[model samples]
Target: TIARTIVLQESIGKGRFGEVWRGKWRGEEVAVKIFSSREERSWFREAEIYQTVMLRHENILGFIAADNKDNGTWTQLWLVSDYHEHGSLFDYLNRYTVTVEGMIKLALSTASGLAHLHMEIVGTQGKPAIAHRDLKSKNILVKKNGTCCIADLGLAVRHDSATDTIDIAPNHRVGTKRYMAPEVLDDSINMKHFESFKRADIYAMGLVFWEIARRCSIGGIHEDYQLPYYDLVPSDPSVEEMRKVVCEQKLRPNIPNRWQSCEALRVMAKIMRECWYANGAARLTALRIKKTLSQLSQQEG
Candidate 1:
């Protein structure tokens, strides 16, 4: 039970829910997400989703345990998971540039994870198709080997094909504004259709791909790491602010023309274009992106 044995080192991050501490559980390090005084449903939802059968994957964050303790006055809810020493991809890319192989590794492994998350196993014991509503670099951790591990299932939605219903979290927190898809920003997203959620996620992935590609140095010349629409939107942009640019203007993140010089960036740009189409149905599937990236990794590496 993670009662008093887990010793916290320091608080690494803070969110609307609570603080994320780099803690020690026995001999190994772990990430402990401590929840604030909010609804108990949100906390339980994450724990339930994480424990879903066949949910474990190499590129997905490893859930260890869920527990809570009462310190007389306060009820401390904790969600423990395996810790990655390298931190989030947002922080990693800011610190250094990636080689051609480095870029491919990060891209392919991430695609693989997303594809698995979107796939459903049909059997007596089946896994539903889960859509990661939030897929920004901040939510994705980089492992010691440079591959990305997708985290933050708090805002995720699961699709039950049998009932044809979407299991959305009871939590009220919305996804990041800058990474929101066009349909989402415009309120035109068909929430009834589960595929719409996946397509929205793909649109967000296009922006994430742009963020990674920007730092992909071809022969030691890469641009500084910046958010998708660093130039177009304010740092803390609102929904209306996002809608004007994404919906009315129909502006997607830019892919530098110079990227065409490198074959890796060339294909990456091509994939990004397909991902953030004005028409959500026109976007590429996570499986297609995964396969294309596999071929790119083979050719480049």
Candidate 2:
């Protein structure tokens, strides 16, 4: 059994489930994501997914333990994991512009994580292909070493090839409206098809790539970080608002010609274009993205 001797130190974040605290456990820092009474089921389901066998990977959030404690008046459900003081990638990017190598490392590490998550190992104790329904910068944490780890697996879906069944949470929760794919925005997403889910992830990955690319500084020349389609939509866009822009207009984030000046940025632009395809099937797989980034990294070296 994992130790539950956590001492909540400070509130780092708050979500629909509850508050997240930067805590100390066994003389080490940890992230304690606690749940409220109403979201106990959310906590339980997230814990179950985190505890899945063979789910451990360097780019995935390291799960420590899960427990529900009763404090007489109310029950607190806690999910503990390794802590990164740098916070989410969104915060990190906003604070500092990344070098060419830093940007490649961040993007490559993220692609590696998603590729691993989508890969299913066959055996007695096989890992199922998991689709991260939410793949925005906010859900990715930047480590001290400058690499990113995918976090917040509550909205993830696991596909069991043996049974041809997808294990999705029994919730109507949708991903971030701004990052939703065309199929998803128009309600044309084939939920029955597991590949559809993976394609949607690729679409979101394109938007994330745009976010990172915006902050990529080459020779001290970098554009300000902006959300995808920042010019076309309001600050807080709704599903319908996003649909009008993404589905109806078929608009995508602008890729500056300046990116073509650099080899790495040029490759990233090409990958982003493939990922933002109107047709889901035309999008590149996570593994392909990872492989492309690997080549880009080698070339940059």
Candidate 3:
């Protein structure tokens, strides 16, 4: 019903699941991710997770509505969310070097989102602890105020603490190889342990921190936009390549020496290093990272 009212405009982006379009509902703007019929189950799962109680947060992507519209020939699975003209954190970081404040805001907002996602409330209608298996720069959208919202939950899993069970995905979809944790790269992660998934997310979060910090200019010095481990692997590295580089070689993205000059970058570099530990259990929690960044922001103020 409401899905039929949406007028999709230009194509904004594309993901493994489907194409994203800039859309309009009534007079307000929105971002619509249209999935193919083949991805119906994935779309339904994502919509279910979005509708979970207490799932709504300032840092999480705001879900408006989801429905399947039949055009006689085919079905278009639609998931509509708040529109952000700035696109993704990947696109924004590529376009402009971030100020110290911008870097902190982006990092803090991301951690906040993950913390909220990982937290499980105990109640009849409580939200389950969710882990975003595919946390990366591209899955995060940047708001007009410079904060970021976490998106792309097709690969996410929910954990029910009450029953001590995990609701794993039905598909065999893998996350971005480049951002995979060492445990994931080596296929040693405990699939049954829900915390293992959260820890892996932390490892990827570390990589995202490195991506954001690289563009932070201190005293007019900033590195060009480069993906993490750009020097180590090919543009589209295979799992074997990533395994050899990350798991066997234990190589991590280089932390610039100049980062020590800026308090914010130095703290971020130290945190990122902790987040990239080969042992998933050694990685810092999202809440810990959030606290560290919050203190750093206060110091700057």
Candidate 4:
């Protein structure tokens, strides 16, 4: 079957390294990504991390196969998995309005997946913690049942490298510009920044949760938009922005008037605030976020 030309049909999406395709493996719908030869390092790292984690959460993207194709023009490395052609959370929020229950499901499901990565196995005792280096709305996938799972572990960091080392590159930036954490912007701060991965993930998750709340609540009109990390000076435009703006820019998913009328909205806002603490150590952990949301879900019903 090596020369069979597996038939990777239709483009699904693309990441930093390659383009994703919808393909058939034994007649099943699958997502296939073919990496450019130059990006082999990234392909290897991503494949290793995903396979090693053996991750299985309803909120985590499931893995299927990675194949090396015979077509030599590009060393085609295929990563086939479940298909979510609806695009991303950003796309969904821009179109369809969500119910409160729907919002809770999204928050809980996402936090749960992050919690799973943070989990330390009983016997392994000192396994390295995992972090989603690139946690963004586009990377979050939603199923028809209202549950969400994290995809694109291409930039994920795990603490299990030899001698507790993190193999992440010094110059490699792990997150999207809009969703990047404050500390991640400065190379002077730290290249091996996985030390605060847990808290950093929470901060990004807060923004993600906020995005969901903005669209689902009110009349789809936010009153005031508070940029989570926009207060810094142009001396410090967002670290990821390559010194484009000096002051913090306006936040996305504006705060709507209807949000003011609901107590649940208040709690949601409170959580977002806690997650965006300037000090990474001060921010809430993924497990804590999971717990708080679970409790809120219980009380609201």
- For each candidate in turn, the TM-score is 0.97, 0.97, 0.98, 0.82
Tell me the tens digit of each residue's lDDT in model 4 across 1-301: 5214456779878566678877766776667777766667777777776787657777888777666654656565666678776656766666666777778888888899888877655345344567887787778888778788888888777775556666563325456665666555443335465657777678788888887787564555442323333344333244545323311442333344566587667777778878776567788878888898888788867
Query: Which model is ahead, 2 or 3, in terms of TM-score?
Result: 3
Candidate with best lDDT: 3
At residue 288, give the lDDT of candidate 2. Answer: 96
What candidate 3 gets wrong by more than 4 Å, as runs, is none
Better of 2 and 4 by TM-score: 2
Candidate 3 lDDT tens digits, 31-141: 998989988888888888788547898899999988888778998898989999999899999999999999999999999999999998878878889999999999998
The per-model lDDT (C-alpha) reads 0.87, 0.89, 0.91, 0.69
Best-to-worst ranking by lDDT:
3, 2, 1, 4
Candidate 3: residue 166 lDDT (0-100): 91
lDDT of 1 at 238: 96
Model 2 C-alpha RMSD vs. true structure (Å) is 1.2
TM-score: model 4 vs. ground truth:
0.82
Better of 2 and 3 by lDDT: 3
Q: Any residue pairs clashing in model 2, and if so which? A: none
When summed lDDT is taken over every stretch of 10 residues in candidate 3, the lowest stretch is 46-55
lDDT of 1 by residue, 222-250 (tens): 89999988889999899999899888888
